[PDB]
């Protein structure tokens, strides 16, 4: 069972309790975007990332208590209609906002709360190539190469889970000069059980800068519930410090993975690294999510044979 | 063998490599004091903690290259005479400085380098009580109580090493309401082998604030050697982040220990905690060092019986 988060008196995580970190409720975000939460009926802004002024032009204490009707008059009606009470928490509303400089808006609903993520923003032959791979190994190779071409990441791996939850790099596409990880295996604890569970529900996550301090969300508890705000569905969620350290020690400045899900079970990850911090553009992330779903379908087919 | 320190490309320490942390050369200090290093012949200031202006009234780049003859005209001759080339690195010169507000100065020599520590500053019946204890347990109890009375620390333990380097609290004096650690045992890795080795040579160390960021020493390499500056003999040395985290998880804001050395081997520690950060005053530290040496002598006697 999860430890309380750090802002509810919980301990700092060590290797003795990797699996107890409540990674879904860090009460903080990554600094390359801003996050607000708002009441799902009134649109009242309830919580604000402390960097909100960087992206939204108003300080957290000024945004607090204003409504989405006032702040986002052109989106608020569409937002309400798209995300009614009781919809799945993976259902998203997306908009491109004009700002005096575009800003990508992504919204999802958890219970009675709307979670709004703001970040700056600017194939058919590839799909057929995945379809055309004659065996699992070839599929893995095509997938990693395709994703590397799409994203420009220094390394793209297909990381496969064994039944004991150990992991192995079974294919990779890599920049000239990087060491090989192909065939290397890793303990189950490197991607602990609560992360694997989260990754079965929320299919993409990332750390754009593995040295960047998390930006608090405040007030940290959702005022509706006096309880932590679920951020498993927010790509801007702060990453576990244990994993950030693993990445820094690996010389990785930016990391992103997409779940490969087969028969409702986490089969593996498309796992990406960059040496230098790097924000994969929002449109490239959406494409990569779609490729993950397509790869998932293809892996199910090839491994059966 | 030690990893390189973090400023020479070394990794961040994890539980897989506790013993490889080069804790003696962190290239940084605790913020409750200031540290300079100076050439042992010229007195030229070679390195400066980045907080030097807080204590010394001049910025690091202004202090750099000035001589101790200019900066400390009243102490420099005595300092030279007290710490000639080739003296033991545990030999100290101490002075009380008048400042516009006293400042404790502690100096030692390592090779051709003088290491100067600056921090703010403001029994016979007890010794006889240690002498008078009729057995090891009673000695342990008297020692912890005496140290607690001297220091005001919330907890004072006698932590004894077993031959396998596991540790046990064999006596303690504690504030009302604290849980007992008496009889609890701990793995050898909690005080890893390079720490135990350091603690056989340098008999007192502390962390005054277990949440305080370390203050860099710059330039970080000694310009004499283009190599790290040994800080094992400096009480202001930054503490291992692994240990700081252990203490925070324990609810300890301030920690200090004194080595108990029997037949040249590390027998145990007088180990002190405070819940709130706390700078044990310099004069109290000197007294506590002396009590450690006296306790060491007494333990040798009692355990033989
Ligand atoms: C005691 C806790 C530990 C720990 C926790 C942890 N790890 C993750 C997430 C990931 N770990 C990954 C591992 C690898 N990436 C690689 O490239 C390789 C080998 C080549 C390995 C073994 C990966 C891929 C992830 C997923 C996220 C990502 O793609 O960047 C989490 C969850 C992080 C989060 O979502 O907030 C946690 C809690 N990892 C350890 O090694 C120990 C120290
Ligand atoms: C993988 C590394 C780990 C680690 C490293 C570490 N620990 C120390 C120093 C100390 N540890 C102490 C342990 C205890 N204090 C207690 O009160 C109790 C139990 C009641 C224990 C087990 C102590 C007493 C010290 C000495 C310093 C002090 O008195 O505060 C070091 C060296 C620190 C330094 O001098 O810079 C290191 C590297 N400890 C772990 O638990 C693992 C994570």
Numbering used by the authors:
A (entry chain A), B (entry chain A): 7 to 107, 110 to 130, 140 to 322
From the article:
Phytochromes sense ambient light levels in plants, fungi, and bacteria. The proteins detect light and trigger intracellular signalling cascades, which regulate many light-dependent phenotypes. The PAS and GAF domains hold a tetrapyrrole bilin chromophore, represented by phytochromobilin, phycocyanobilin, or biliverdin in plants, cyanobacteria, or bacteria, respectively. Upon light absorption by the chromophore, a sequence of structural changes is initiated, which shuttles the protein from a red light-absorbing state (Pr) to a far-red light-absorbing state (Pfr) or vice versa.
The PAS-GAF fragment of the D. radiodurans phytochrome was crystallised in essentially the same conditions but the cryoprotectant 2-methyl-2, 4-pentanediol was added directly to the crystallisation buffer. Those changes resulted in the protein packing as monomers instead of dimers in contrast to previously published conditions. The space group C121 and cell dimensions were highly similar to the crystals from monomeric PAS-GAF21. We recorded diffraction data at cryogenic conditions at the European Synchrotron Radiation Facility (ESRF) and solved the structure to 1.35 Å resolution by molecular replacement with 4Q0H9 as a search model. We refer to this structure as “LowT”. The 1.35 Å resolution to which the LowT structure has been determined is the highest reported so far for a wild-type PAS-GAF fragment. We also note that the LowT data support a water molecule with partial occupancy close to Tyr263. The water is hydrogen-bonded to the A-ring carbonyl, the pyrrole water and the functionally important Asp207. The diffuse electron density in the LowT structure could be due to radiation damage or to alternate conformations of the chromophore-protein bond. Importantly, the LowT structure corroborates the SFX structures.
